[PDB]
Subunit: 43 residues, 4 copies
Amino acid sequence: IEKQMDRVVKEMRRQLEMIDKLTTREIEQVELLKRIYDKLTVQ
Amino acid sequence: IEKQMDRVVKEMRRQLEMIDKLTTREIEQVELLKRIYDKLTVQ
Amino acid sequence: IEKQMDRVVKEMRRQLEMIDKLTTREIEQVELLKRIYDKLTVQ
Amino acid sequence: IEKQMDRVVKEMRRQLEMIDKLTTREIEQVELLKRIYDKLTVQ
Ligand SMILES: [Ca+2]
């Protein structure tokens, strides 16, 4: 159970890394959406 | 195992916070998209 | 440890529900993005 | 606790699959956004 639970902890931290990466990319989308909207308002 | 239980709980609280922030950013994104869509119809 | 691990399982299933909900909303964004792109190609 | 360990592992595998799918949909989304952005510049 000790080793099995140690694997669980490692796998959780791995999935947190995936979520952090996803978060950064989703923020990049907000920057693009804002830029697109501004271009339409300008036109 | 009580120590590793504490590690698991800690990681899960971190995950919850990150998922919660993904959800609030999703809201921001879709409402931008809907504005953009409105303007392409209006134009 | 039994009750503590039972709480962990419940909290995991709860976070899976959040992720499922987020997934559905993210798909809705793809539909909007596709529609926006088509409107530009049309114009 | 061995039974509850199996429940935890099962939920974590499900989560991984769902996060993985969120990441591939993110790719689809941003490349649509970039196309849209290109066209507003080109137009
Ligand atoms: Ca998105």
